[PDB]
Ligand binder design. Structure first.
Ligand SMILES: CC(=O)SCCNC(=O)CCNC(=O)[C@@H](O)C(C)(C)COP(=O)(O)OP(=O)(O)OC[C@@H]1O[C@@H](n2cnc3c(N)ncnc32)[C@H](O)[C@@H]1OP(=O)(O)O
Ligand SMILES: CC(=O)SCCNC(=O)CCNC(=O)[C@@H](O)C(C)(C)COP(=O)(O)OP(=O)(O)OC[C@@H]1O[C@@H](n2cnc3c(N)ncnc32)[C@H](O)[C@@H]1OP(=O)(O)O
Ligand SMILES: CC(=O)SCCNC(=O)CCNC(=O)[C@H](O)C(C)(C)COP(=O)(O)OP(=O)(O)OC[C@H]1O[C@@H](n2cnc3c(N)ncnc32)[C@H](O)[C@@H]1OP(=O)(O)O
Lengths: 193, 194, 194
């Protein structure tokens, strides 16, 4: 790791990422935000980089842009996250792992994923690239979450289920059936909106 | 700074868990006070640190007031496993309970007399109003405003940018998806006025 | 005479997570057993500690009985990050699984063969009946009595002072708000008999 880190995103999401970065031992966070702070330039000095954008589509776009412009996009992983030695977390892939997250045996976390505070990824899950597993959201064993999915605060998915790319599981929702097409699912049990 | 002994007002279940937190913090001895079930509070007691171990928000506030008005220091009991952002604000010596594995993120503010129960989460920029109770596993998303004397039940949650009126109850397992500026009892997914 | 090896009965996903707990506790070698050629339980297996990593409550109980009756020790696998009150009672050498970041508060009792899965919470004074399974993130409020062989689904919860009949299922995401002394399957917020 370098001593400094760029945090793209001047917002509460950025601040939380900065806290994780400090936890990992980064000495200084340099914020950039083209809307809300200091504008990025492709001629900035090369330090470790992180994309603290909550929106999955925007995060992917900026990830591609920054990754093209030469920067290494590290993972920010809080020291209190518990990760099985047999779990797979893509290295240097802009993944955020917040405090008290647990990732169990043989689960796979793809690039650009957010695992937010106290979320749980059970054994043998696959969490697709640029997905956001929100605060307290829990995936049971063998759950496959598609690319760019959003699992809302305190939501959950029962074992052996799949959620299609680009889907939203609402805050508090309990998914009890496979979903092979994109949707927005809310309620206990979760149903299409 | 902390005294060797602490008086815990509340000889109950809530009292037992507070005692565990106090021991976690390093207190050597906990002395229970309870006006109905054991040793009585008296204004003449030595000035040891105090805590109000009463779950009921209204009663906790009444007792907090009585104790503080008698010149006793009501400390915070904060489990060592709680993770608190350096930019979060937790009111000092304000009878706040922070249970194990609680997380409080950047710029969140926790006011006097609040309970943050086991494994609750207070996300960035929240304000948790005085004498509120955020129950076990209850989670507030970013920029949530919880009113004074509110009660968020077990495993409940509030979506981002929302406000809950003073003196409201969010039921166990409830998911608040809309602002509520009129107090009430809200239950279900999504949370509806009862 | 160093204790290094453990048999884990159940070569499944549940087996893998049990192995990670055992290795967290400092076991060096995990020997999986299951009903497949070359790895079956046998009466004359060399004696090492056992654990039964079977999620199904009824089968777990049956295998527990068999291994126990062969004079073997069925240990508890308890992750070091679990927080257990000094006044809580967890039955010793009783095949109990306690996963990462579980909290068990003052005076709660955990009976033999129980599973407390990742990030579950057992509040003060609960009684969790033998061979019950409290799933990932499921939370029992204070003084809750869970019957034998119960299953509390992912992110379910039970409100304070409630009792759940032996052999019941609380569905994933369900919030139990009333006593159930007749067994059944209870789903939704609030939980209703299926
Ligand atoms: C910082 C972190 O990472 S943690 C928190 C992160 N964020 C979240 O969890 C937010 C997740 N988003 C949501 O839950 C949802 O509001 C969404 C995406 C399901 C729906 O969004 P929108 O379509 O904008 O819904 P909107 O607020 O306009 O409400 C339409 C409604 O559907 C209902 N509804 C909205 N969200 C939910 C929900 N989570 N559960 C149940 N019902 C819901 C509303 O009650 C309203 O119903 P009505 O027609 O009776 O008025
Ligand atoms: C130690 C800790 O911090 S963790 C645990 C802390 N404590 C809690 O979480 C308890 C929170 N309390 C509750 O959720 C609720 O029972 C309250 C406050 C919303 C309502 O309490 P009461 O008014 O006494 O409700 P009561 O039990 O009489 O039930 C009336 C009911 O509304 C329903 N109901 C009660 N609570 C809920 C709930 N949380 N969600 C959905 N429905 C509910 C009941 O099923 C019954 O409906 P019915 O008319 O169909 O029979
Ligand atoms: C590793 C861990 O320990 S974490 C994961 C642990 N495992 C779990 O949490 C699984 C818990 N199991 C469940 O919740 C269940 O689905 C049960 C036991 C409630 C029901 O199981 P089944 O009877 O097989 O339900 P099935 O999937 O056939 O669905 C029957 C229906 O009830 C509904 N349903 C199923 N589960 C639930 C639930 N948890 N909440 C609300 N409704 C539900 C379905 O939507 C369907 O309704 P429909 O008639 O409109 O189609």
């Amino acid at each position: 790791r370098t001593e400094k880190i760029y945090i793209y995103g001047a917002s509460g999401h950025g601040l939380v990422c900065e806290d994780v970065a400090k936890n990992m031992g980064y000495k200084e966070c340099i914020f950039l935000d083209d809307f809300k702070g200091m504008k990025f330039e492709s001629t900035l000095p090369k330090y470790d980089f992180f994309i603290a954008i909550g929106n999955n589509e925007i995060r992917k776009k900026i990830y591609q842009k920054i990754s093209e412009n030469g920067f290494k996009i590290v993972n920010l992983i809080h020291k209190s996250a518990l990760i099985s030695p047999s779990a797979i977390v893509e290295e240097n892939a802009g993944i955020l792992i917040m405090p008290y997250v647990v990732i169990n045996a043989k689960a796979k976390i793809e690039k650009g994923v957010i695992l937010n505070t106290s979320s749980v990824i059970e054994h043998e899950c696959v969490i697709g690239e640029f997905s956001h597993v929100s605060v307290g959201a829990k995936c049971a064993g063998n759950v496959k979450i598609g690319k760019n999915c959003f699992l809302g605060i305190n939501s959950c998915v029962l074992p052996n289920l799949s959620l299609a790319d680009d889907s939203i599981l609402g805050g508090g929702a309990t998914l009890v059936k496979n979903q092979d097409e994109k949707g927005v699912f809310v309620g206990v049990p979760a149903k299409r909106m």
